Symmetry: D2
Subunit: 419 residues, 4 copies
Amino acid sequence: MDKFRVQGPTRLQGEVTISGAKNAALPILFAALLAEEPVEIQNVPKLKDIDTTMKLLTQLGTKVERXGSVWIDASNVNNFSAPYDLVKTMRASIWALGPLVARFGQGQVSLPGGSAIGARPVDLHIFGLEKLGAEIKLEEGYVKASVNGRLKGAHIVMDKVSVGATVTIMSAATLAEGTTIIENAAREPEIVDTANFLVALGAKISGQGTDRITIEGVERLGGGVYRVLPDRIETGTFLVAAAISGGKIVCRNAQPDTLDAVLAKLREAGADIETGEDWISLDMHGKRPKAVTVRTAPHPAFPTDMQAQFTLLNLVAEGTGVITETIFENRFMHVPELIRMGAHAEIESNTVICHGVEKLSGAQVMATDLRASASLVLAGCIAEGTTVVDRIYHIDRGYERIEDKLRALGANIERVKGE
Amino acid sequence: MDKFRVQGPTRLQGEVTISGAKNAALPILFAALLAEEPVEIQNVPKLKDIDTTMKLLTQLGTKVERXGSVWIDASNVNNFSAPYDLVKTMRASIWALGPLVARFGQGQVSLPGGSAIGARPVDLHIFGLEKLGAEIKLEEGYVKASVNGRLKGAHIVMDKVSVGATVTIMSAATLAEGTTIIENAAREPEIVDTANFLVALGAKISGQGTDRITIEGVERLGGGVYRVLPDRIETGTFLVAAAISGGKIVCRNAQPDTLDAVLAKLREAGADIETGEDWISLDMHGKRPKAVTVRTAPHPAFPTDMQAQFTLLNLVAEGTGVITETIFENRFMHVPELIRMGAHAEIESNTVICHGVEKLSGAQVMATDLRASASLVLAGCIAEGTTVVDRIYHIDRGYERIEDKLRALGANIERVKGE
Amino acid sequence: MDKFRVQGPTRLQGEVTISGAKNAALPILFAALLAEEPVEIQNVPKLKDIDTTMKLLTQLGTKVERXGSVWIDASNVNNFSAPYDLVKTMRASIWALGPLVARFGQGQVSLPGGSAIGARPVDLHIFGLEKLGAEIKLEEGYVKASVNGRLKGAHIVMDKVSVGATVTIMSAATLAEGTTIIENAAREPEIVDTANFLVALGAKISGQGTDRITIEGVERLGGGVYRVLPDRIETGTFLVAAAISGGKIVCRNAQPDTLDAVLAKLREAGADIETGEDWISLDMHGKRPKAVTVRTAPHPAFPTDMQAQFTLLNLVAEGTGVITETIFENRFMHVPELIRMGAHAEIESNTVICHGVEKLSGAQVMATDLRASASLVLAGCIAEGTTVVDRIYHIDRGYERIEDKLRALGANIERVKGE
Amino acid sequence: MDKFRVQGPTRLQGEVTISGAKNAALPILFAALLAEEPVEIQNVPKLKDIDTTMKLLTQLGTKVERXGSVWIDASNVNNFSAPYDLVKTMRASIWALGPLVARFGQGQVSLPGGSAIGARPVDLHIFGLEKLGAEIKLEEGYVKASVNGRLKGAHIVMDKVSVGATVTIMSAATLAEGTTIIENAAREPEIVDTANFLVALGAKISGQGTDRITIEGVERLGGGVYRVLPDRIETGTFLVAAAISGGKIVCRNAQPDTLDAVLAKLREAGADIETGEDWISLDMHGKRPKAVTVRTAPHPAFPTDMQAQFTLLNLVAEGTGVITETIFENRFMHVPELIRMGAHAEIESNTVICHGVEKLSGAQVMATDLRASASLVLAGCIAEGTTVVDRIYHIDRGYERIEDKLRALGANIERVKGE
Ligand SMILES: C=C(O[C@H]1[C@H](O)[C@@H](CO)O[C@H](OP(=O)(O)OP(=O)(O)OC[C@H]2O[C@@H](n3ccc(=O)[nH]c3=O)[C@H](O)[C@@H]2O)[C@@H]1NC(C)=O)C(=O)O
Ligand SMILES: C=C(O[C@H]1[C@H](O)[C@@H](CO)O[C@H](OP(=O)(O)OP(=O)(O)OC[C@H]2O[C@@H](n3ccc(=O)[nH]c3=O)[C@H](O)[C@@H]2O)[C@@H]1NC(C)=O)C(=O)O
Ligand SMILES: C=C(O[C@H]1[C@H](O)[C@@H](CO)O[C@H](OP(=O)(O)OP(=O)(O)OC[C@H]2O[C@@H](n3ccc(=O)[nH]c3=O)[C@H](O)[C@@H]2O)[C@@H]1NC(C)=O)C(=O)O
Ligand SMILES: C=C(O[C@H]1[C@H](O)[C@@H](CO)O[C@H](OP(=O)(O)OP(=O)(O)OC[C@H]2O[C@@H](n3ccc(=O)[nH]c3=O)[C@H](O)[C@@H]2O)[C@@H]1NC(C)=O)C(=O)O
């Protein structure tokens, strides 16, 4: 069991080049199951979930290889199932269902169980596919979708704003018979990116980025080349790294308009921010951050994927900060760990009341989930002494060589084994 | 203290002509304060809040008169305060602050207190105005806004989706210097309608209806004519009226695209729905409704203003219905009253678990707020016997002579005094 | 519509003699319906609810008269129903059901509708009576109970801790055949007082004050004399009055052991407290209170009836105070009103985050419920200038001559009309 | 990674002998650190946490050994710290802090991090120890307690009911100077058992079992023998086993009065229950269970440790069952897993709405915590086909060879490896 040994404090400054978005690459890779012709996806980060995805696709009969790009040839998909073994390691596997039933009339994916940050049901994915004409049956833990011929467009109103269900329904609808409308669709940048990818293959989609998406089905989708957009969560993570360590940083290969909420909050924390077409610079001028109030919600509001990072920022900020999480019911696992490092906080239902302290103390902590692990590593960077973050494999799920990029910013970090 | 005597059951059927939206006419009436020339607002419903608004505007030195339209001449606005006496009867008065400070550099409005359905703070309106350059102070219960010269455009990210704050900021921004961007803005049809009204006066606005509104300030706004859009909640209320009484109805002067969530839910309840350019028909074919699941949220999701009405529908429906209110913290006051009529429900935090019964029993109940009073009246129409709904003055706030429109559908309803 | 016009600031100091507990007097007065012989209840406060109760009792055929005591003669009961008109003014009327069905085999009470501070169902009262053998029906909004002969003892486990339901079940059980056991009973001081009252009439009760109450039914209860214990909420209210005005007070005719949580919280706020056998003294030594954290819960935890008062204390205290209400879902109505007076707070689900300020500003505010009204009045006492608390009739429901007692502490208060 | 392969459906019937309470043995074993003379604890179950506890004690310089009993000689404790590597595997280790600082004036325990079912802070333990005079510092993740001389009795009011904090405070108070009073103490049967154990060593404690515990400190505690009470949760687990499989079972070595809430709920589910002095019999007479409503809360209310089990019972019961969890914020992890087996449920905040189905389908599921793992195993016993419960090491924490006991009841179970 790998761990990260961090010695602080250290001001983090310099530059970092943002990788392609984990959450755009994933839905795109699955959307590729719709392509009857070779597809090249560019700027795909090297993450654990990308590997698991390539594995799942290959197991479906797809020809896959990668480097900076991932080349896909799904012309001969001949297997339509995602076994429990793979699904249990990556719930995103659920995104295989829509494309498979939409193009081949069938698909079986193991129903994901519970997740670290919440129950995370997939009822909206199922609801959507059923509205498109698919028949869904659950047997032996497998959601089994089927349709005789082509799915049929339908006007669907979402009971909840869901990034995942939006991707599933929008993706399957591209090969449906007629027009599909997704009312109360997720507006996240990754939805836009996945939509534009599908359109690149020959799909007809409009409204991506708004509350209502309109898809006009076609008989088939071809191939092509598409470059994934910048990872806004990675970008925010590094901006937070500078913001909490009195440093300065410039993020290259970034897309500023995907982060208005985060940037505005960073400015309120006292950060001096400047943005360009493809870059963002943040300078704390050696100042300690000011406490801010945050409420997560669907894009363009403050993103839940930056919540643990801002929880850390408030814990070392001057003043009382309040963090309200409205997306996932169990996403405060980093709090108890930060408390071990000397932080002061109280959890009241889905809100964390933070009382910032001058400095944290190095201690042994445990990563419980992707964003939580990144926060613990950042905490280790600014804490006094040695911090050992156990189970950092979590971090390898959504950050490409975070270790090197942090070191390049002045961090004293070492990856160690010792199970 | 007026009351409503309703005798049932009665299958409600026929037609109704939807009035102009209460929640579009109000923000527009206040936005009119920005007009330097005569303005005519058409299709304005005759509601208690419209009367209070006319008095408030008059008290600001505005010349006001009405019938179907409301004619406004705010060329000579010479007073800039909204007193506690008026604000305490209508919190919407808060909408006078932005236009006043934007056009005259000053404005004072009594800070609204607690509301029946929630604390409903206005911190976001104040925040927005401050971001536009206004200096805000609270003294003696009055929020006093001021700015030296014109307000200045700014990029504002909303910590919460707010219909009211969106109106305040968007309205004030039309006269600000430069460009204003509202990130995570409310998307309600009434926001769209208010934006279009401001545009008709000469304002420059785009993005209304999406989560990002862009306003380019101008030196001043003129006058003109604008017709308020159909009231979607009144429409939904009457559609429910037929849906729960096994009836049929046709709503005239309606705008179907403002009710996708509501219509979708009525179909799930078993309703046969048809829509035209400006009309909506619903036929229950004598059926008892089927229990549905609802979760209120910002437009285009299911609206909180239809929540009590659907709570009623589920309480007389087949099966177990679940209603989750995420907008207001005290909007279940109709439940205890419906329970007095034989309904079976349990409140669990912000969710109501409903167990539909065949028929309700007439009983004496108390209206506590606008939408709940409408639900109790509808309940009276379908319950067995006589139902007396006390304090129906609440209903005259958002419905234009509802007993008449209901009587034309076959309701045995009478307005009595007896304090 | 009476109001309290209060001039501040004024330090509150001196002495106050605590009246009998409103919440002990009420359940005992209803318990008296079980008495076949004359009963005298001493130390009964003069409150609106006592008058409504004496009114309801008289209406049942009981002979009632009062002064310091209330003399009851229920040897004859010629009517067994509590009308809607009365119940609507006092939900506590529900307590007439149990004694009536237990002694006469019949009784009916109008099902209470919604309450200002919550839905407050009475399902547990009904459940308990049904477990004791009563048949319950709901017709025309009335709860109708009946039993052929005597009720029979049962082992009942309460799904939730309820003061009211514990009173109903314990009271009815006294005339039941056999032994009754109430598991997970409320342990409030008033339950202990009502049990001791019943025992004085000849009932056999043990465990009152613990989570399991054992009642041994007897054929009939006689008469007697019983003194109601001191009102702990009135006591806490006056202690807070001193704590938030830098004052020093001595509460006479008090019972310290019923207020451990409150006293401990006041000490944490910086109050110097001393207690005797029947008195409590509190001295703030001119200090501003220190913010505290509070979580309401069943006795002996911090009581929800002191929640609004402590919210006020935190809003004028030094630091960040947190109030969490777990009993009633709508008991923060005082917050929006205090905010009108310059307080700073945010409500997050069932928790209020307070940011204490130096001085409040006098303003026009509205009382919404009993404890809230008392808090607004205290706020007026320490605020700068003139505060007008509308609808103070709410305060006359549970405070005997609060105006006089406050004036005797130095308050500049005046009860004015002017509707 | 061990797993359980279960084959269903198999009716569970027969007998089981209840082991000593896991949650009584643990606090007692730590309380033993106060004993200056040899102690023998009887009826201690063989569980993972007991082993970890013996390791921790041993490492403090304690002489420990076991079989049915555990013999402790803590006369020579020479080390006062519980390392991170031990506490990370068992947060109950926190219970070493109080005894150590109370008897030796010092002690340091690694502050526990996050837990599977919630953040579970220990702020109340620290608060209590500080009130007893201990100085608490946090450094490098270790909570360091110290006091010069002996702790001093104090009147402590818990602003939340905590089993753990109650144990910590009550344990340390036994050696304190003077009288300590714990207001709003936990009333769990294990608190009673731990208090009687301390009393057996020479401590002076009264009130155990009520919301107020009084402890009179003494100079030192001797040795002795004490038998741990029956495990009510294990008992409840096996009673549910029979109740959901239409079986009949008898639990030996049980203590009925510790399960009033659970038995009452089982009867409501249709179970025929009889109890003796030390046994409990439950017969379902081949009937399918009836859906019940549950709300966890401090003893004697329904226990949170039986919540997952009852979630299961409702998922295979007739009707709609509602489970509300008020103790831990993340204890619904079993729901997603049961859903994979064909169950129908929706999670609404802290409530689960269940829609019972006839039969579950065997599938691969994952144990997430102790009670959840037991629930999944039981589900496997009644499900149709093969069920594989991964990570059953969780079950070995609180159940002594559950495999054998279930098999003795007719279950087709087998522990397999295969990582
Ligand atoms: C957790 C991460 O990323 C997450 C990110 O937090 C969320 C929210 O923006 O959207 C993606 O998941 P997701 O698709 O499961 O998110 P959502 O579907 O939007 O879930 C939002 C809310 O809806 C609920 N939900 C979702 C689907 C459904 O059928 N039913 C349902 O009730 C969720 O359980 C939650 O209560 C990202 N993952 C990918 C692979 O695209 C991370 O990388 O750190
Ligand atoms: C209640 C009615 O209508 C309401 C309707 O329910 C709501 C929601 O769609 O939007 C209008 O009020 P509103 O402007 O106060 O609504 P919002 O601002 O959107 O409030 C939404 C949520 O944000 C909160 N909120 C709002 C403003 C602010 O500064 N801060 C804040 O925290 C609210 O208290 C609530 O928790 C309608 N009223 C008018 C006059 O336009 C009705 O007619 O029955
Ligand atoms: C509100 C006041 O006093 C109240 C005090 O707050 C509460 C709590 O201690 O106990 C008395 O009411 P109560 O009898 O209605 O209180 P409870 O029954 O204990 O209610 C507690 C919780 O249980 C719920 N509840 C109660 C009864 C029932 O059948 N079902 C149920 O769900 C409540 O709605 C609430 O969510 C006092 N009133 C009298 C007349 O004795 C006041 O005087 O200011
Ligand atoms: C989880 C198990 O058992 C648990 C059982 O659920 C709970 C509740 O009855 O009481 C014991 O834990 P515990 O001591 O941590 O329980 P509690 O202290 O009572 O916690 C109750 C509530 O108070 C909170 N809490 C507790 C202590 C504190 O200092 N602060 C605090 O906020 C908790 O996080 C929770 O929100 C049992 N464990 C042992 C080893 O005795 C199990 O065996 O499955």
